[PDB]
Every structure is written in structure tokens, then in C-alpha cells.
């Protein structure tokens, strides 16, 4: 008791980190089935975004982690403004984090070898704060997410 | 004639010429520019559908025009259920008709498919097309850039 939400956040953060490491092809120290499924489905979405929303992605420049955080929150706030949650939407949170991370690697001014760790943090926070309860109510990562996409 | 008649006939011509292109059979003599961009954009969508949805399509055995018509109707109903229309969606109508024509050929199909494709486009998007600059202006400007 006193650790349920802590465990949930750390699990979300682990998924977010491993997805972003997959995007940049960074070897993880620790993959589970949830990670494999998430990596497939989210990466599909990331490529779809980079291909089809190029003209909007070209409209901004991700010159800092601070800018990345603001853009992430703005876009995510708009996506989720209707108050609806489903697994597809959760997938897009990870996928757009990846889109922004790729932009940041190309566009960031300061050297930042740790960029993906900082992005994983604000991706995890968004998931927890906006979908954390829904995740718990909808089967979690194993009985909910994996079953949805397998 | 009526605006309805001219719109439907133009849609049908577009459907026919696209499906001829899908069948890779030559036609004798005036490809309009809307035909040319539709050929390009719809065929690329068709190839993407045939790749991405291979597992669904391989489940269908389109042994008659009736089966093709029903598949088309049901899929199109879902696609357009949200009441949104745009040019990308209009392109996918043509593309999915071509997907189904190809399947029919393997499993006059051309005449019947061009007809039910035209009817759906006219009935569900004809006024939108009119309001959004039509084929030889709005459509080509949309896909050129």
C-alpha cells in the first residue's frame, strides 16, 4: 500500500523508454510481448505521421527539450480534448513522442545524448495523468493492450 | 439536361477510365487531366490497400458481381458513416472499386462495377464535389503542387 501508482508510472515509463530506444535503435539494458506489440503498432503510426503530416511537421522546429515538451503537450491536449480514451489513442501518445524525438535529434541546438530519456519522461507523465486510471480499468498492459492488438 | 445528369455522367466516365486502367486494356482515343491524376493517385492507394489489407482480401471469394456490390456497399457505409467528405475519401472509392474488379476478374464486371461505383460517388459525394471546385479544378489542384 502506497506504491500502486508508483509501480504504474514506472511501468509506463519503461514502455516509453523502450519504445523511444527502439525508434533511435538504442540497445536496451533489459523485450516483453507488450513492448513488441507496442513497438510494431506505434512505429507503424510514427511512419504514417512522418509520411502524411510532413507539411505540418515542417511548420515547427524542435530546438530544445523545453520546446519539445510544449509541442508534445499542445498536440496531446488537442487530441484528448474530447475526453475519450482507447488503446489506439494510447498508441498515438508513444508514436508522437517518437516523431518529436526524431525531430529533436535533427533540430536540437544543444548537444543532448540523453534527449530520449527526457522525452520518455514527459511521455510517461502524460500517459499516467490522462489515461492512468483508464489503463487500470481496461485490463492493463497484458489483459487489455496485448489482447487488443494480437 | 440537369446538373445531376452531367455530374453523374462525368463521375461514370471517371470510374470507367480508372477501371480500364486497372484492367490494363487500351482504349481508343481524350484523357482529361482529372483522369490522369485519378489514375496516379487512386492506383497508388489501390496498391497500398492490396498490400495492407491482404489478409482481409484473401478471405473474400468474389465469385459474383453481387458479392462485390455487397462488399463495396458495406465497407463504404463504414468509411463514410462519420459524414465527412474530402478528396482523399473520394479517391479511395475509386481505388476500392478497382480492388474489387481485380478480385472479380480472378474469382461484364467492368460495366457493373463502374456503375455501382458511380452511383455511390454521385449519391454520397456529388454535391460536395460541386461545392469544392469540381473535377477539372478542385480535384486536380488538390493533388498537384
Amino acid at each position: 500500500l502506497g506504491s500502486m501508482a508508483e509501480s504504474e508510472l514506472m511501468h509506463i515509463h519503461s514502455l516509453a523508454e523502450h519504445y523511444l530506444q527502439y525508434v533511435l535503435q538504442v540497445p536496451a539494458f533489459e523485450p516483453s510481448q507488450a513492448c513488441r506489440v507496442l513497438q510494431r503498432v506505434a512505429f507503424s503510426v510514427q511512419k504514417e505521421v512522418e509520411k502524411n503530416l510532413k507539411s505540418y511537421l515542417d511548420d515547427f522546429h524542435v530546438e530544445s527539450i523545453d520546446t519539445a515538451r510544449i509541442i508534445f503537450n499542445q498536440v496531446m491536449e488537442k487530441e484528448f480534448e474530447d475526453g475519450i480514451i482507447n488503446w489506439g489513442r494510447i498508441v498515438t501518445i508513444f508514436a508522437f513522442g517518437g516523431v518529436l524525438l526524431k525531430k529533436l535529434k535533427q533540430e536540437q541546438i544543444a548537444l543532448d545524448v540523453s534527449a530520449y530519456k527526457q522525452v520518455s519522461s514527459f511521455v510517461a507523465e502524460f500517459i499516467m495523468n490522462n489515461t492512468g486510471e483508464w489503463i487500470r480499468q481496461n485490463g492493463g498492459w497484458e489483459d487489455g493492450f496485448i489482447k487488443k492488438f494480437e | 439536361g440537369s446538373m445531376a445528369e452531367s455530374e453523374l455522367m462525368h463521375i461514370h466516365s471517371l470510374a470507367e477510365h480508372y477501371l480500364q486502367y486497372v484492367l490494363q486494356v487500351p482504349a481508343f482515343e481524350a484523357p482529361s487531366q482529372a483522369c490522369r491524376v485519378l489514375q496516379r493517385v487512386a492506383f497508388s492507394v489501390q496498391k497500398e490497400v492490396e498490400k495492407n489489407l491482404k489478409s482481409y482480401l484473401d478471405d473474400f471469394h468474389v465469385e459474383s458481381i453481387d458479392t462485390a456490390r455487397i462488399i463495396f456497399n458495406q465497407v463504404m457505409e463504414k468509411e463514410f458513416e462519420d459524414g465527412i467528405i474530402n478528396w482523399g475519401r473520394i479517391v479511395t472509392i475509386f481505388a476500392f472499386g478497382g480492388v474489387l474488379l481485380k478480385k472479380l476478374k480472378q474469382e461484364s464486371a467492368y460495366k457493373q462495377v463502374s456503375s455501382f461505383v458511380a452511383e455511390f460517388i454521385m449519391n454520397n459525394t456529388g454535391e460536395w464535389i460541386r461545392q469544392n471546385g469540381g473535377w477539372e479544378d478542385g480535384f486536380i489542384k488538390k493533388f498537384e503542387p
Binding site: - | 462488399i71 457505409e77 463504414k78 468509411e79 462519420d82 479511395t92
Partner: peptide, 23 residues
């Protein structure tokens, strides 16, 4: 008909992706 909902969803996704690719 599950296939109609599922294919229809994917075709809508393709359509709207195409719409966005061209602005």
C-alpha cells in the same frame, strides 16, 4: 460485417492520410 467495420476503418485512415499528405 466485422470486416466491413475493420476494412472501412483502414480505408478511412488511408483516405484521410492521403488528404493530409496533400495539405
Amino acid at each position: 460485417e466485422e470486416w466491413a467495420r475493420e476494412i472501412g476503418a483502414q480505408l478511412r485512415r488511408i483516405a484521410d492520410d492521403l488528404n493530409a499528405q496533400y495539405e
